[PDB]
């Protein structure tokens, strides 16, 4: 029962989704959530937001600049490394490296090229950037090292107090490492198919497997005495608006159309007459909605809830896409993996009626008729249905997999955003004409493709950030330019 | 445009399927109601008029010979294999024969598992067994070779299909057939894991490495969906003489004792309620004095079954439990963990039968199998059954882990008596009740605590194939031709 390792491990865990409310608000409530189609901003006082594409630097820089992310990560990695090397015990540092990848994947996925390999002990980013490809190559190398070490020490354990993800269970850490490896492999499957295949198939071939049961979901079980940060953030200003962040129209439209029994687990009911679940539209004129925010459905969440990093459902949907779209050898069939993912999701949230849900070949995502009468979407959403069809086209299979993966990944907005950019699925609603404050830079139908680099970097690391933009980014440093694995 | 081989194929494929568990009521009664069921701990005989049975260990030859002698099994199998082979070879389409060979292994594994050494490799086109026997080891080696051929061919042709009418197991879905072949390969690998560990490892690990995987979902369970117009044969057999006895076969005390003790929500799917006051589920004891029970059979719980039900060959739950044992007991590389596989098997089973409350069930570390207090007051078991509990314990001993896996696999394999019987003989689990003193009519040959270890060879073979069956007994069996001698994979 050591404070120093314990404190370090928790610090590392916090660099994924921070326990600091305002940091988590920025990374996941105001950025990930809306860009991934789960959340919608709901504070009339915000004249500049990420969702409206006119965000100021203090909103966009957080992943790359916040002390609670990179500086904290590398400072604490160094501590755990010392402990491992000075107690001749490689387990703690191997687990720390897995958390490193979980944290920094979100960072590169937000900006594209980033400092990574050249970040020294001190955690400073005043050094040359890596290409996003080099970053991903290092991720794979790092995960493989951790997997090898932990598998050699599969019967070892961390103390429970040093691990509120898995209570020091080394085998679950290996499963998460293989699972994360599969996520990142599929991430690069369009741009780097041979590498993706090798990493995807390697993950599934490992003797300890992936996250296959909800009992092994990667969630940070840190809260109860300390409040869940997402809880506090989305509940801010509750009395006036119902909350600073509401569930998005998109997710609720899909789930309403499918009569999805998971809705009761995701959302609180709206105050709009006749409509149990109503989401708030993203990329809208916020000032006009001041008086109406409070009527929409809200995020169902408790101050003691764990924070999700990755679930068993996603792993099934990854294997489904790996086989069906990319032709990788996943030791199974797409039809099985798709249904297993949906079943795992229903079970995760305690919803019943999955059989009828999986048999539904006629229900489609619902229209968005705005009960406030301000942001009604005049067109139809996708006609993609639930029931697996083996004879369907590749495009339909991919839309089917990603749509269900997306629903099942509530509320992992950053992951949903990455999948939306890689695949184009699910078919998210566009920003409105008034809500797109990009001055023409952002296409309302495509949304934000990345965050711009921090102004701090142009000031203090000028030559290096300019190299990244001129040599690695393949476009201007704005929200319209796609990242490497998303380039079409 | 339809040709003779289109028609020949449909009839042939259904014929082959019927050689696993027959659609003929009396054949199925013998193979699975009177033999498999009781010996596996699922079923119990319940006809006061039967003075000679397999469960009492004094069965006559007409009961014991059926697997090896019945025309509805071997003769039908090899006759129809020959037909499908011709179709494949003369239409340049290897899919039908590859599927047929999988069914062959499903059918004949039950036969060798019943007797030990059997005729196999030397059975010619005509389906006659008047030839030299194979050792059980040679039979299993051939099974693996045959499954591997089928898997290779079907995987090369994974997007091909049989017509639906030629396949009431999988409706011609080639990939499901591969999954069943890999699954059957894993079953047979684990079967031989005590006696042939190196071979078992190779076959088990090979099965799970295959690109199309195993049976993982209940939608892909191997069941023969042949009934509805034709009555399920198990339904008819267990319901025989219903008005007097409630049925010729009742659920066994063993299975109900375990499930009652665990408050198992699958009971409502397995059994009909008893007529005994205060006891919803009560099983009938196996290996008892039947004449004394004449007036009481009707009060026990019954097999819950319908005339249109498919007949089960293998389910997704078993595959999970096989992988659980492969990793935990035998140290094979199953690309996962025993804890996961055990829970997945139990979840698949609950889902298969529409039962809820699996989370609470899997969290139960205190409930134990119940005692057997016979409400008739004749065959009460005075001792305690095993104290094995449900909840997975990673720190438990190997022996406890194996008992835990096999016990849940066994419950989940209702009513695959022949498979349960094989697992009981290989592992000693679950801890089945012994025959009673009065119920053991073996004249001392069968140990009441161990039960029947095999069927004796047919008398027909001593008459018409004397030299060959004598060779099997003297050279291959390693013991006398009776119910006490263990088969090769069960030898300690
Ligand atoms: Zn470079
Ligand atoms: Zn399937
Ligand atoms: Zn034809
Ligand atoms: Zn005959
Ligand atoms: Zn699996
Ligand atoms: Zn697990």
Short mmCIF file of C-alpha atoms in Angstrom, two decimals, chain B residues 88-384:
data_model
loop_
_atom_site.label_atom_id
_atom_site.label_comp_id
_atom_site.label_asym_id
_atom_site.label_seq_id
_atom_site.Cartn_x
_atom_site.Cartn_y
_atom_site.Cartn_z
CA UNK B 88 -19.62 -34.55 -55.76
CA UNK B 89 -17.20 -36.39 -58.05
CA UNK B 90 -19.51 -36.24 -61.07
CA UNK B 91 -20.54 -32.59 -60.78
CA UNK B 92 -17.05 -31.31 -59.90
CA UNK B 93 -18.53 -29.95 -56.66
CA UNK B 94 -16.78 -31.07 -53.47
CA UNK B 95 -19.15 -29.28 -51.02
CA UNK B 96 -21.81 -31.98 -50.54
CA UNK B 97 -19.37 -34.82 -49.73
CA UNK B 98 -17.39 -32.54 -47.39
CA UNK B 99 -20.57 -31.85 -45.39
CA UNK B 100 -21.50 -35.53 -45.49
CA UNK B 101 -18.13 -36.46 -43.93
CA UNK B 102 -18.79 -34.08 -41.01
CA UNK B 103 -22.12 -35.85 -40.36
CA UNK B 104 -20.28 -39.16 -40.61
CA UNK B 105 -18.03 -38.14 -37.70
CA UNK B 106 -20.98 -36.85 -35.66
CA UNK B 107 -22.72 -40.21 -36.13
CA UNK B 108 -19.78 -42.61 -35.69
CA UNK B 109 -18.13 -40.85 -32.73
CA UNK B 110 -21.20 -41.89 -30.72
CA UNK B 111 -20.71 -45.48 -31.94
CA UNK B 112 -17.01 -45.81 -31.01
CA UNK B 113 -17.65 -43.93 -27.74
CA UNK B 114 -20.20 -46.64 -26.86
CA UNK B 115 -18.08 -49.77 -27.57
CA UNK B 116 -14.42 -48.75 -27.91
CA UNK B 117 -12.74 -50.50 -30.86
CA UNK B 118 -15.09 -50.66 -33.87
CA UNK B 119 -15.05 -51.39 -37.57
CA UNK B 120 -14.40 -48.11 -39.33
CA UNK B 121 -11.59 -47.74 -41.89
CA UNK B 122 -12.31 -51.15 -43.46
CA UNK B 123 -16.05 -50.59 -43.90
CA UNK B 124 -16.51 -50.78 -47.68
CA UNK B 125 -19.07 -49.26 -50.03
CA UNK B 126 -21.71 -51.84 -49.07
CA UNK B 127 -21.82 -50.68 -45.40
CA UNK B 128 -21.13 -54.19 -44.05
CA UNK B 129 -19.19 -54.49 -40.78
CA UNK B 130 -17.98 -58.06 -41.44
CA UNK B 131 -14.36 -56.90 -41.46
CA UNK B 132 -11.45 -56.24 -39.08
CA UNK B 133 -11.94 -53.62 -36.34
CA UNK B 134 -9.92 -50.44 -35.77
CA UNK B 135 -8.51 -49.50 -32.40
CA UNK B 136 -10.38 -46.53 -30.91
CA UNK B 137 -7.19 -44.47 -31.37
CA UNK B 138 -7.14 -45.27 -35.11
CA UNK B 139 -10.83 -44.33 -35.33
CA UNK B 140 -10.16 -40.94 -33.69
CA UNK B 141 -7.14 -40.30 -35.94
CA UNK B 142 -9.40 -40.91 -38.93
CA UNK B 143 -12.06 -38.56 -37.47
CA UNK B 144 -9.47 -35.75 -37.30
CA UNK B 145 -8.26 -36.46 -40.83
CA UNK B 146 -11.83 -36.48 -42.13
CA UNK B 147 -12.84 -33.25 -40.36
CA UNK B 148 -9.67 -31.51 -41.56
CA UNK B 149 -10.39 -32.49 -45.19
CA UNK B 150 -13.95 -31.17 -44.89
CA UNK B 151 -12.83 -27.95 -43.21
CA UNK B 152 -10.21 -27.29 -45.90
CA UNK B 153 -12.61 -27.94 -48.81
CA UNK B 154 -15.52 -25.96 -47.37
CA UNK B 155 -13.30 -23.02 -46.42
CA UNK B 156 -11.94 -22.89 -49.99
CA UNK B 157 -15.64 -22.83 -51.05
CA UNK B 158 -16.95 -20.63 -48.22
CA UNK B 159 -19.36 -18.66 -50.46
CA UNK B 160 -20.87 -21.78 -52.02
CA UNK B 161 -24.14 -23.21 -50.69
CA UNK B 162 -26.28 -26.32 -50.59
CA UNK B 163 -29.99 -25.94 -51.37
CA UNK B 164 -32.09 -25.49 -48.20
CA UNK B 165 -34.06 -28.71 -48.81
CA UNK B 166 -30.76 -30.66 -48.76
CA UNK B 167 -29.99 -29.48 -45.20
CA UNK B 168 -32.36 -29.15 -42.20
CA UNK B 169 -29.41 -28.51 -39.90
CA UNK B 170 -27.99 -25.30 -41.43
CA UNK B 171 -30.10 -24.73 -44.59
CA UNK B 172 -27.04 -25.21 -46.77
CA UNK B 173 -24.88 -22.58 -45.08
CA UNK B 174 -21.32 -23.76 -45.69
CA UNK B 175 -19.70 -21.50 -43.09
CA UNK B 176 -21.90 -22.86 -40.29
CA UNK B 177 -20.86 -26.35 -41.35
CA UNK B 178 -17.21 -25.35 -40.99
CA UNK B 179 -17.96 -23.94 -37.51
CA UNK B 180 -19.57 -27.22 -36.51
CA UNK B 181 -16.62 -29.17 -37.93
CA UNK B 182 -14.11 -27.09 -35.89
CA UNK B 183 -16.37 -27.46 -32.85
CA UNK B 184 -16.65 -31.22 -33.24
CA UNK B 185 -12.87 -31.28 -33.75
CA UNK B 186 -12.47 -29.51 -30.39
CA UNK B 187 -14.89 -31.92 -28.65
CA UNK B 188 -12.98 -34.94 -29.87
CA UNK B 189 -9.63 -33.35 -29.06
CA UNK B 190 -10.65 -32.77 -25.45
CA UNK B 191 -12.08 -36.33 -25.41
CA UNK B 192 -8.56 -37.70 -25.89
CA UNK B 193 -6.73 -35.08 -23.80
CA UNK B 194 -5.92 -37.43 -20.88
CA UNK B 195 -4.63 -40.32 -22.99
CA UNK B 196 -3.15 -38.42 -25.97
CA UNK B 197 -2.19 -34.93 -24.73
CA UNK B 198 0.10 -33.95 -27.63
CA UNK B 199 -2.50 -34.87 -30.25
CA UNK B 200 -5.28 -33.19 -28.24
CA UNK B 201 -3.26 -29.96 -28.05
CA UNK B 202 -2.55 -29.95 -31.77
CA UNK B 203 -6.20 -30.55 -32.68
CA UNK B 204 -7.71 -28.27 -30.03
CA UNK B 205 -5.39 -25.35 -30.88
CA UNK B 206 -5.81 -25.94 -34.61
CA UNK B 207 -9.62 -25.78 -34.26
CA UNK B 208 -9.58 -22.41 -32.46
CA UNK B 209 -6.98 -21.01 -34.89
CA UNK B 210 -9.21 -21.51 -37.91
CA UNK B 211 -10.29 -18.38 -39.76
CA UNK B 212 -14.04 -19.17 -39.57
CA UNK B 213 -14.10 -20.01 -35.88
CA UNK B 214 -16.36 -22.30 -33.91
CA UNK B 215 -20.02 -22.31 -32.87
CA UNK B 216 -20.19 -19.13 -30.82
CA UNK B 217 -23.84 -18.10 -31.07
CA UNK B 218 -27.03 -20.00 -30.37
CA UNK B 219 -28.20 -19.13 -33.92
CA UNK B 220 -25.49 -21.55 -35.11
CA UNK B 221 -26.23 -24.47 -32.76
CA UNK B 222 -26.08 -27.81 -34.59
CA UNK B 223 -29.69 -28.99 -34.37
CA UNK B 224 -31.62 -31.12 -36.85
CA UNK B 225 -34.76 -29.11 -37.62
CA UNK B 226 -36.67 -32.04 -39.15
CA UNK B 227 -39.88 -32.18 -37.10
CA UNK B 228 -43.36 -30.62 -36.90
CA UNK B 229 -45.03 -32.80 -39.51
CA UNK B 230 -42.88 -35.73 -38.40
CA UNK B 231 -42.87 -36.05 -34.59
CA UNK B 232 -39.63 -35.54 -32.65
CA UNK B 233 -38.56 -39.10 -31.73
CA UNK B 234 -37.43 -38.21 -28.19
CA UNK B 235 -40.85 -36.67 -27.55
CA UNK B 236 -42.62 -39.90 -28.54
CA UNK B 237 -40.20 -42.18 -26.68
CA UNK B 238 -40.26 -40.38 -23.30
CA UNK B 239 -44.07 -40.00 -23.52
CA UNK B 240 -44.69 -43.75 -24.18
CA UNK B 241 -47.18 -45.17 -21.63
CA UNK B 242 -47.90 -41.67 -20.33
CA UNK B 243 -51.30 -42.57 -18.81
CA UNK B 244 -49.90 -45.18 -16.43
CA UNK B 245 -46.37 -43.97 -15.63
CA UNK B 246 -46.21 -40.36 -16.86
CA UNK B 247 -43.70 -41.73 -19.41
CA UNK B 248 -41.20 -44.51 -20.19
CA UNK B 249 -38.42 -42.07 -19.28
CA UNK B 250 -38.30 -39.32 -16.62
CA UNK B 251 -35.67 -36.72 -15.79
CA UNK B 252 -32.99 -38.10 -13.48
CA UNK B 253 -32.67 -37.25 -9.79
CA UNK B 254 -29.06 -36.14 -10.42
CA UNK B 255 -29.73 -33.23 -12.79
CA UNK B 256 -32.69 -31.96 -10.73
CA UNK B 257 -30.73 -32.14 -7.43
CA UNK B 258 -27.98 -29.93 -8.86
CA UNK B 259 -30.43 -27.44 -10.40
CA UNK B 260 -32.67 -27.28 -7.33
CA UNK B 261 -29.68 -26.63 -5.07
CA UNK B 262 -28.54 -23.83 -7.40
CA UNK B 263 -32.08 -22.40 -7.76
CA UNK B 264 -31.43 -22.66 -11.48
CA UNK B 265 -33.85 -20.65 -13.64
CA UNK B 266 -33.35 -23.11 -16.52
CA UNK B 267 -35.48 -25.72 -14.65
CA UNK B 268 -38.74 -24.32 -16.10
CA UNK B 269 -37.34 -24.92 -19.62
CA UNK B 270 -36.06 -28.45 -18.89
CA UNK B 271 -38.81 -30.03 -16.80
CA UNK B 272 -42.54 -30.16 -16.10
CA UNK B 273 -43.49 -29.82 -12.45
CA UNK B 274 -43.89 -32.91 -10.27
CA UNK B 275 -47.14 -33.94 -8.57
CA UNK B 276 -45.33 -34.39 -5.23
CA UNK B 277 -46.63 -31.91 -2.60
CA UNK B 278 -44.22 -29.06 -1.84
CA UNK B 279 -41.61 -30.00 -4.47
CA UNK B 280 -41.88 -28.32 -7.86
CA UNK B 281 -39.02 -30.32 -9.40
CA UNK B 282 -38.28 -33.93 -8.44
CA UNK B 283 -36.19 -36.32 -10.53
CA UNK B 284 -36.33 -40.11 -10.61
CA UNK B 285 -33.35 -42.08 -9.40
CA UNK B 286 -31.31 -44.16 -11.90
CA UNK B 287 -30.30 -47.78 -11.35
CA UNK B 288 -33.16 -48.72 -9.04
CA UNK B 289 -35.61 -51.56 -8.48
CA UNK B 290 -38.26 -50.63 -11.05
CA UNK B 291 -41.07 -53.05 -10.06
CA UNK B 292 -41.43 -51.40 -6.64
CA UNK B 293 -41.94 -47.96 -8.22
CA UNK B 294 -44.89 -48.86 -10.46
CA UNK B 295 -47.54 -46.76 -8.69
CA UNK B 296 -45.23 -43.78 -8.09
CA UNK B 297 -43.53 -43.00 -11.45
CA UNK B 298 -46.39 -40.72 -12.50
CA UNK B 299 -45.70 -38.23 -9.65
CA UNK B 300 -42.19 -37.21 -10.74
CA UNK B 301 -41.23 -34.24 -12.89
CA UNK B 302 -41.23 -34.98 -16.61
CA UNK B 303 -39.11 -34.09 -19.59
CA UNK B 304 -40.34 -30.83 -21.07
CA UNK B 305 -40.35 -31.48 -24.82
CA UNK B 306 -42.54 -30.86 -27.87
CA UNK B 307 -43.24 -32.98 -30.97
CA UNK B 308 -41.90 -30.21 -33.28
CA UNK B 309 -38.65 -29.55 -31.36
CA UNK B 310 -35.37 -29.83 -33.29
CA UNK B 311 -32.94 -32.52 -32.15
CA UNK B 312 -29.75 -31.12 -30.61
CA UNK B 313 -26.29 -32.31 -31.77
CA UNK B 314 -24.04 -29.59 -30.27
CA UNK B 315 -24.53 -26.09 -28.83
CA UNK B 316 -22.50 -22.90 -28.42
CA UNK B 317 -22.34 -23.35 -24.64
CA UNK B 318 -20.37 -26.62 -24.95
CA UNK B 319 -17.79 -24.90 -27.15
CA UNK B 320 -17.21 -22.29 -24.43
CA UNK B 321 -16.89 -24.95 -21.73
CA UNK B 322 -14.48 -26.93 -23.95
CA UNK B 323 -12.25 -23.86 -24.32
CA UNK B 324 -12.53 -23.24 -20.58
CA UNK B 325 -11.24 -26.79 -19.83
CA UNK B 326 -8.66 -26.72 -22.61
CA UNK B 327 -7.02 -23.64 -21.03
CA UNK B 328 -7.57 -24.32 -17.31
CA UNK B 329 -6.91 -28.06 -17.13
CA UNK B 330 -4.79 -28.87 -20.15
CA UNK B 331 -2.89 -25.60 -20.62
CA UNK B 332 -3.78 -25.25 -24.31
CA UNK B 333 -3.65 -21.87 -26.05
CA UNK B 334 -7.30 -20.87 -26.53
CA UNK B 335 -6.74 -17.15 -27.15
CA UNK B 336 -8.65 -16.22 -24.03
CA UNK B 337 -9.14 -16.98 -20.37
CA UNK B 338 -10.93 -19.77 -18.52
CA UNK B 339 -12.92 -17.27 -16.43
CA UNK B 340 -14.36 -15.70 -19.60
CA UNK B 341 -15.09 -19.04 -21.28
CA UNK B 342 -16.86 -20.45 -18.21
CA UNK B 343 -19.13 -17.40 -17.88
CA UNK B 344 -19.76 -17.24 -21.64
CA UNK B 345 -20.90 -20.87 -21.59
CA UNK B 346 -23.34 -20.25 -18.76
CA UNK B 347 -24.67 -17.05 -20.38
CA UNK B 348 -25.11 -18.85 -23.72
CA UNK B 349 -27.05 -21.62 -21.97
CA UNK B 350 -29.39 -19.27 -20.08
CA UNK B 351 -29.98 -17.38 -23.33
CA UNK B 352 -30.55 -20.64 -25.29
CA UNK B 353 -33.43 -21.55 -22.97
CA UNK B 354 -34.80 -18.04 -22.39
CA UNK B 355 -33.88 -18.01 -18.68
CA UNK B 356 -33.06 -14.77 -16.83
CA UNK B 357 -31.05 -13.98 -13.69
CA UNK B 358 -27.72 -15.28 -15.02
CA UNK B 359 -25.72 -12.51 -13.27
CA UNK B 360 -26.98 -13.57 -9.83
CA UNK B 361 -26.45 -17.21 -10.82
CA UNK B 362 -22.81 -16.59 -11.78
CA UNK B 363 -22.24 -14.59 -8.58
CA UNK B 364 -23.45 -17.47 -6.38
CA UNK B 365 -20.56 -18.88 -4.35
CA UNK B 366 -22.63 -20.55 -1.56
CA UNK B 367 -25.46 -22.65 -3.10
CA UNK B 368 -24.67 -26.36 -3.35
CA UNK B 369 -26.37 -29.33 -5.06
CA UNK B 370 -29.32 -30.53 -2.98
CA UNK B 371 -29.66 -33.90 -1.23
CA UNK B 372 -31.96 -36.51 -2.78
CA UNK B 373 -34.79 -37.19 -0.38
CA UNK B 374 -37.03 -39.57 -2.37
CA UNK B 375 -40.67 -38.53 -1.75
CA UNK B 376 -41.69 -42.16 -2.42
CA UNK B 377 -39.38 -43.10 0.49
CA UNK B 378 -37.67 -45.94 -1.43
CA UNK B 379 -34.46 -44.59 -3.00
CA UNK B 380 -33.33 -41.75 -0.79
CA UNK B 381 -29.61 -41.05 -1.13
CA UNK B 382 -28.26 -40.88 2.42
CA UNK B 383 -25.03 -39.05 1.55
CA UNK B 384 -24.34 -35.53 0.32
#
